[PDB]
Amino acid sequence: NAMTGLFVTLEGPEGAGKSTNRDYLAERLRERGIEVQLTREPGGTPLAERIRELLLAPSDEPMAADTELLLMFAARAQHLAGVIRPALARGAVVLCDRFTDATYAYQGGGRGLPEARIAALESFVQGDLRPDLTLVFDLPVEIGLARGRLDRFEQEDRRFFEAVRQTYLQRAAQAPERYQVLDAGLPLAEVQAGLDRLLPNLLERLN
Ligand SMILES: Cc1cn([C@H]2C[C@H](O)[C@@H](CO)O2)c(=O)[nH]c1=O
């Protein structure tokens, strides 16, 4: 039937080689003549980036959990219509830094919002669309490393970030067919060799 690309999301903390690994993946794909679209959430479009700004900017006014969740999904709705679905329809590979798993992990695990409510909004915004593959970069939580000023989420405590970590691992266990957990605590080349063994699988998913 209708045109098909490949929707890959990457999840995990910065400082875990997510970005260099995404670049690696992108170059390996592009050398094979495949169109690759790099993007990130929240953000990805002019309006979505403005929503991002509201989400990250520290304020003395506390942001309600529901506000934070609805803003995340608002940016996502804009980003899906403007960037992601159009790329997939061109048969491109989308490599998206963070997606709805981050919502489950941060807003669910970190903020304590019920999984059911996040799931309701996921279906509302996305219909049946989910990533084809989600790469989780897992390693023990590191706090305070390489830190203008801390944004809203950076200000959180170690407990918050441990809940985020564990939620990703839980999610990957609930639907193993959609995830691959990468040991981001392993040497740099050893992880990119994992990416090599992955490429053929990606290519198959794509064509
Ligand atoms: C995509 C996404 C990011 N975040 C956080 C993680 C980062 O701290 C920040 C920017 O990606 O926003 C969420 O809390 N929920 C989400 O759904």
Distance CA 96, CA 207 (A): 19
- Looking at ligand 1, which atom is closest to the CA of residue 101? 17
- As to burial, measured by CB atoms within 10 angstroms (0-12 exposed, 13-18 middle, 19+ buried), residue 49 is middle
DSSP characters over 137-158: EE-----STT-----TTTTS-H
Pairing of strands 179-183, 133-138: parallel
- Where is the chain discontinuous (C–N over 2.5 Å), named by the preceding residue? 147
Distance CA 45, CA 110 (A): 26
Token pair 């609930």 is at which residue? Answer: 174
Q: Which of 10, 41, 111 to mutate to test the pocket of ligand 1 (most atoms within 8 A of CB)?
A: 41
Provide the experimental method for this PDB entry: X-ray
Beta bridge partners of residue 182, listed in sequence order: 137
**Domains contained in the chain, number:** 1
DSSP characters over 2-30: ----EEEEEES-TTSSHHHHHHHHHHHHH
DSSP characters over 186-197: S-HHHHHHHHHH
Distance CA 186, CA 117 (A): 35
Q: Which of 22, 40, 49, 72 to mutate to test the pocket of ligand 1 (most atoms within 8 A of CB)?
A: 72
User: What Å resolution does this PDB entry report?
Assistant: 2.0
Measuring from atom 8 of ligand 1, which residue has the nearest CA?
153
Structural domain for 62, as ranges:
1-207
Q: What's the CATH number where 165 sits?
A: 3.40.50.300
SS (H, E, C) 40-96: ECCCCCHHHHHHHHHHHCCCCCCCCHHHHHHHHHHHHHHHHHHHHHHHHHCCCEEEE
**58: its two tokens:** 């520290």
Expressed in angstroms and rounded, the spacing between residue 41 Cα and the centre of ligand 1 is: 7
Expressed in angstroms and rounded, the spacing between residue 56 Cα and the centre of ligand 1 is: 9
**158: its two tokens:** 């170690």
**Binding-site residue set for ATP:** 12-19
Distance CA 67, CA 106 (A): 14
Expressed in angstroms and rounded, the spacing between residue 154 Cα and the centre of ligand 1 is: 10
Token pair 């390693």 is at which residue? Answer: 139
Among 83, 58, 85, 54, which Cα is nearest to 71's? 54
